[PDB]
């Protein structure tokens, strides 16, 4: 965790919120309680990430500036969270869930397939600078275990060739039907809806007295 | 941060010449009572030792850390 100034990643890279971005900023502060600019740094840091994935040292200094906080304060927030990237991020940035639930349901299986398809090691960007694979931890959505979040694509329940299919979709064209490519809906017993197969009771159903 | 060496009073004789030795450069001292530091449990007893032995004394009052109020909740106060 040390930013050794590099021509690419260093403040020479000027950063400033787009007129549109700055707007987004003000909104954030107000959402937070009055006189508390500091709470807004994680959201403001997120929009710097939205602006640019790299988010270099220059970008964090601006965040601290806009939020008038000790610069270190922003540096500490960026380092602690994995969501922020302090290094350039691939356009797609796929992340594969490899906690025990997904592994038990084959998460590892998927990995090998994706490494071959992207033809690259796990953890770095494709030469095409189009893809970036990382072994991220539990991303939620375990019921659907095989899983790979690509910039919130959160594709889930994915068989190996599925991903290959998805990756191809990403490689040529866009928006490859993000979601559980499996037939099931959201999370649902693959069998059906044992929980509630009847119609839902309407408003004020069996509302207790009092 | 240990305070077990700030408990007993000590009386120490005044420091004297420590000239360098020409042959080996070791420190050399002509004062016999230099390395002697006697330890006394209470200020009254140490003063007594100086009076009967005839050495001059200049007692320094013990200064103990003042009580300081601390509470983990207090710094969490955004107000201050």
């Amino acid at each position: 965790f040390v930013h050794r100034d590099t021509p690419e990643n260093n403040p020479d890279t000027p950063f400033d919120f787009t007129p549109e971005n700055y707007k987004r900023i003000e909104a954030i502060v107000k959402n937070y309680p009055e006189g508390h600019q500091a709470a807004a740094v994680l959201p403001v840091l997120d929009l710097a990430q939205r602006q640019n994935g790299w988010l270099p040292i220059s970008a964090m200094n601006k965040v601290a500036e806009v939020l008038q906080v000790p610069p270190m304060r922003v540096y500490e927030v960026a380092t602690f969270y994995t969501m922020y990237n302090r290094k350039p991020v691939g356009k797609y940035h796929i992340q594969v869930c490899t906690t025990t639930p997904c592994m038990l349901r084959d998460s590892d299986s998927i990995l090998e397939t994706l490494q071959r398809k992207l033809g690259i090691k796990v953890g770095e960007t494709t030469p095409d600078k189009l893809f970036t694979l990382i072994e991220v931890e539990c991303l939620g959505a375990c019921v659907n275990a095989p899983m790979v979040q690509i910039n919130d694509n959160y594709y889930e329940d994915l068989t190996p060739k599925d991903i290959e299919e998805i990756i191809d979709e990403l490689k040529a064209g866009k928006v490859p039907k993000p979601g559980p490519r499996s037939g099931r809906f959201c999370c649902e017993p693959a069998g059906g809806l044992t929980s509630l197969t009847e119609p839902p009771k309407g408003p004020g159903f069996g509302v207790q007295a009092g | 941060s240990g305070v077990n060496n700030t408990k007993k009073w000590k009386m120490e004789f005044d420091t004297r010449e420590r000239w360098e030795n020409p042959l080996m450069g070791w420190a050399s001292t002509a004062d016999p009572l230099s390395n002697m530091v006697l330890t006394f449990s209470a200020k009254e007893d140490a003063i007594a030792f100086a009076e009967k032995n005839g050495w001059s004394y200049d007692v320094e009052e013990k200064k103990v850390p003042k009580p300081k109020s601390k509470s983990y909740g207090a710094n969490f106060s955004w107000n201050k």
Partner: protein, 106 residues
Amino acid sequence: PSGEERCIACKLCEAICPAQAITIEAEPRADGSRRTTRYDIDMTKCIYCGFCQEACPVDAIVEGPNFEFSTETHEELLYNKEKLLNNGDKWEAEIAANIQADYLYR
């Protein structure tokens, strides 16, 4: 072996010497490493206890096999770093064999 003297001036060989024989003063060598500017064992003060051999973490100071170092003048018996380092170079082969034989025991 490389040739860098083992002592790193932790100075506990000075601390445990019973006779106050070893005098060590140190300063960071330009390399940035830690070395002793002056290491003086006063052999007339030393009572050859062998604790220094014991205490050294890098085992830089060792009790060498030679017992025949009788000297015409008292000053020769006082030893600075250069005599001891020279003593170390002369007897290193046997010192290494001796430490080799007894280290499992220690």
